[PDB]
Amino acid sequence: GSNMVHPNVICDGCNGPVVGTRYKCSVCPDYDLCSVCEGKGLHRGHTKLAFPSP
Ligand SMILES: NC(=[NH2+])NCCC[C@H](N)C(=O)O
Ligand SMILES: [Zn+2]
Ligand SMILES: [Zn+2]
């Protein structure tokens, strides 16, 4: 399923897991958001790649 946890990823907005779509900053080396933090506009100024859980 595409709506599952991404293993070994911690959201840099809330320090929790990333379930469903992972938002990986394309600029910073190691920055990721979960869908809630992404929806709140955290880190909005950088382009990210958004992809489902493998
Ligand atoms: N509590 C944290 N935000 N730790 C840093 C996580 C860095 C990066 N998002 C990763 O999953 O590897
Ligand atoms: Zn989060
Ligand atoms: Zn960034």
Author numbering: 118 to 171
Q: What wording appears in the published article?
A:
To determine whether the amino-acid arginine, which is abundant in the cytosol, could be a substrate for p62ZZ, we employed NMR titration experiments. A free arginine binds to p62ZZ, but free glutamic acid, leucine, or glutamine do not. To elucidate the mechanistic basis for the arginine association, we obtained the crystal structure of p62ZZ in complex with arginine. Structural comparison of p62ZZ-RE and p62ZZ-arginine complexes reveals that the intermolecular contacts constraining the side chain and the α-amino-terminal NH3+ group of Arg1 are conserved in both complexes, however, D147 and R139 no longer contribute to the interaction with free arginine.Fig. 5 p62 is not a direct arginine sensor in mTORC1 pathway. a Superimposed 1H,15N HSQC spectra of p62ZZ (115–190) collected upon titration with the indicated free amino acids. Our results show that p62ZZ binds tighter to RL than to free arginine amino acid (Kd = 1.5 mM), however, weaker to Nt-R degron. To determine whether the activation of mTORC1 by arginine requires the arginine-binding capacity of p62, we reconstituted p62-/- cells with retroviruses expressing p62 WT or the p62 mutants that are unable to bind arginine (D129K, D147K, or D149K) and analyzed the arginine-mediated mTORC1 activation under arginine or amino acids starvation. We found that overexpression of the p62 mutants, impaired in arginine binding, rescued the mTORC1 activation almost at the same level as WT p62. These data demonstrate that activation of the mTORC1 pathway by arginine is largely independent of the arginine-binding capacity of p62. Taken together, our findings suggest that unlike arginylated substrates, a free arginine is incapable of inducing autophagy. We further demonstrate that p62 is necessary for arginine-mediated mTORC1 activation but p62 does not serve as a direct arginine sensor.
